[PDB]
Design a protein around this ligand. Structure first.
Ligand SMILES: NC(=O)c1ccc[n+]([C@@H]2O[C@H](COP(=O)([O-])OP(=O)(O)OC[C@H]3O[C@@H](n4cnc5c(N)ncnc54)[C@H](OP(=O)(O)O)[C@@H]3O)[C@@H](O)[C@H]2O)c1
Ligand SMILES: C[C@@H](C(=O)O)c1cccc(Oc2ccccc2)c1
Ligand SMILES: C[C@@H](C(=O)O)c1cccc(Oc2ccccc2)c1
Ligand SMILES: C[C@@H](C(=O)O)c1cccc(Oc2ccccc2)c1
Ligand SMILES: C[C@@H](C(=O)O)c1cccc(Oc2ccccc2)c1
Length: 343
């Protein structure tokens, strides 16, 4: 329980993470209320939308300064009396809540997830795993022999959309930007990995899947979204999970050729369905429970990229978050990008 700590703070609204966010060095350690845990963060998750958050896009009325980081895993170092009925000092806990980019974060006990130990694999589940699980269960209409296309398939959430679709006996196609990532996809049971830098995705889908794909787990936006719509089967479902190709722009939007979208959907009786995890929190506990079971049992690969093969090596310390965000946006990661705060 130190007097002071470091944390990241959004000091200016911008999708340029380095220009928006400051490493603040002499911050008091916040104290937990009656219903709160104080978590010493050991690993924190880097998420594409960290730059949407720094840009102010979740609530454009809220001015800087504000905390940042959506998820953490670590040890309970202090807690309020009511919280102590369910949690104990020293316990491993994980959470999805704002302000994880800090050495210590106050988290309401009611939203914390107990975990068996502090491993970065368990953090991969909190946002990336639950997003894939809930969207596909609630909106995917998966069943044996459906064809599922997953974009950013070798990324944090993509790896789960791939594996969970396979567990539903689907035939799965996955896009990624390298042969190393394609090999990773194959190792997860991907039926058709596509390196979109060396193989034209539109041609692959037209030639190999002429009747189309039944479900798209679409994270990329832009030209990839356009191709995905064209590739939809009759009654197919494209799920808008995100559009990372656009987040760095002033609006966060990626250009699409969507003027003909209503016509295309009518012609195919097909759909475009958005998904925002925070609209489905009633499903979160059950998703996390099943994901954790599969993770511990070794029935789910939870790939972690701690940056050990990045230019400057392992993502250690809050200062490495800047590098880690850049790494994501250079498309370099395989699995979930995680930063370690060692102690
Ligand atoms: N709807 C929700 O509630 C929700 C929740 C969590 C995440 N998401 C979304 O899921 C997506 C993935 O997020 P993540 O945090 O798991 O990241 P991630 O997939 O681990 O990393 C992003 C990957 O996207 C590709 N990429 C990066 N920059 C790109 C660009 N400029 N243009 C095109 N492709 C680019 C790269 O893979 P390739 O090798 O394939 O290029 C990169 O590895 C994002 O759209 C995010 O907003 C949505
Ligand atoms: C797209 C929009 C907003 C947030 C995103 O990424 C999220 C969104 C919500 C919770 C976790 C991650 C992805
Ligand atoms: C119980 C069964 C089932 O509900 O089909 C199952 C087994 C293994 C992983 C699952 O997780 C998911 C979750 C979403 C989509 C596909 C599979 C779901
Ligand atoms: C068409 C596509 C993308 C952006 C557009 O126009 C705007 C203009 C300002 C903010 C957001 C979108 C209009
Ligand atoms: C009970 C659990 C724990 O203490 O975290 C455990 C015990 C032994 C080996 C494990 O191996 C792993 C490690 C990472 C993810 C899944 C399984 C995980």
């Amino acid at each position: 329980i130190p007097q002071a700590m470091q944390k990241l703070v959004v000091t200016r609204l911008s999708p340029n993470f380095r220009e928006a966010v400051t490493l603040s060095r002499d911050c008091p350690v916040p104290l937990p209320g009656d219903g709160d845990l104080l978590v010493r963060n050991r690993f924190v998750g880097v998420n594409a939308s960290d730059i949407n958050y720094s840009a102010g896009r979740y609530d454009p009325s809220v001015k800087p300064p504000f905390d940042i980081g959506f998820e953490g895993i670590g040890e309970v170092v202090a807690l309020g009396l009511s919280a102590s009925a369910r949690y104990t000092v020293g316990q491993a806990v994980a959470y999805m809540a704002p302000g994880s980019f800090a050495e210590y974060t106050v988290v309401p006990a009611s939203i914390a997830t107990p975990v068996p130990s502090v491993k970065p694999e368990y953090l991969t589940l909190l946002v990336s795993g639950t997003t894939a699980y809930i969207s596909l269960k609630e909106l995917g209409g998966l069943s044996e022999g459906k064809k599922v296309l997953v974009t950013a398939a070798a990324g944090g959430t993509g790896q789960f959309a791939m594996q969970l679709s396979k567990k539903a006996k689907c035939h799965v196609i996955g896009t990624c930007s390298s042969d190393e990532k394609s090999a990773f996809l194959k190792s997860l049971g991907c039926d058709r990995p596509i390196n979109y830098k060396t193989e034209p995705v539109g041609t692959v889908l037209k030639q190999e899947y002429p009747e189309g794909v039944d479900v798209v787990y679409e994270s990329v936006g832009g030209a990839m979204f356009d191709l995905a719509v064209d590739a939809l089967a009759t009654k197919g479902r494209l799920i808008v999970i995100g559009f990372i190709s656009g987040y760095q722009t002033p609006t966060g939007l990626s250009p699409v050729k969507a003027g003909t979208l209503p016509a295309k959907l009518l012609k195919k009786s097909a759909s475009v369905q958005g998904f925002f995890l925070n609209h489905y929190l009633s499903k979160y506990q059950a998703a996390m429970s099943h994901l954790l079971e599969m993770c511990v049992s070794g029935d789910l690969v939870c790939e972690v990229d701690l940056g050990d093969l990045s230019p400057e090596g392992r993502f250690t310390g809050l200062e490495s978050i800047f590098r880690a965000v850049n790494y994501m946006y250079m498309g370099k990661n395989t699995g979930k990008i995680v930063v370690e705060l060692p102690h």
